[PDB]
Amino acid sequence: PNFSGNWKIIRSENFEELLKVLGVNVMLRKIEVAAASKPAVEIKQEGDTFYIKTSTTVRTTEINFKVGEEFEEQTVDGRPCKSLVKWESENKMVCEQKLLKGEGPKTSWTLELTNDGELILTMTADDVVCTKVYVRE
Numbered sequence: 001p002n003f004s005g006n007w008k009i010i011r012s013e014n015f016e017e018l019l020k021v022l023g024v025n026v027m028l029r030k031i032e033v034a035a036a037s038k039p040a041v042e043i044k045q046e047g048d049t050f051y052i053k054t055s056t057t058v059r060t061t062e063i064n065f066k067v068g069e070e071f072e073e074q075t076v077d078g079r080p081c082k083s084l085v086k087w088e089s090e091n092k093m094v095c096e097q098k099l100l101k102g103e104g105p106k107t108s109w110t111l112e113l114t115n116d117g118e119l120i121l122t123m124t125a126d127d128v129v130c131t132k133v134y135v136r137e
């Protein structure tokens with residue numbers, strides 16, 4: 001199995017709560033939920049090298065990384081971080097995020113495949129766990 005595809009969302013839990021537990025105010029949460037609550041996910045995987053694009057009608061975000069090599073991106077509440085992805089187990093990867101400036105509650109994300117070929121995204125912030133589920137288009 002592998003992660004490449006244009007993945008369509010079928011479930012999304014607790015995205016706004018991830019923002020709220022990080023202290024993002026209601027104004028800013030409305031803007032983030034409107035732009036990114038239920039994005040499509042496009043992945044191009046070549047072994048350990050990844051391109052991932054999340055998109056809605058109004059916002060696209062793209063990252064490029066290789067497992068085991070540091071890269072820069074932003075946390076879900078918009079703070080710059082340095083990220084590092086590792087395989088937790090076969091076809092489950094976990095991204096550790098370290099803030100570039102100051103401190104804050106821990107954030108992470110995970111992408112994994114189920115035995116039937118669904119893609120499960122987990123995002124964490126403090127004690128909140130957001131789950132999004134996708135199938136290939």
Ligand SMILES: *C/C=C(C)/C=C/C1=C(C)CCCC1(C)C
Nearest residue numbers: 036037038039052054061063109
């Ligand atoms: C609602 C979920 C997101 C907006 C997740 C975003 C995201 C990125 C912007 C980088 C690819 C990793 C991933 C966590 C899928």
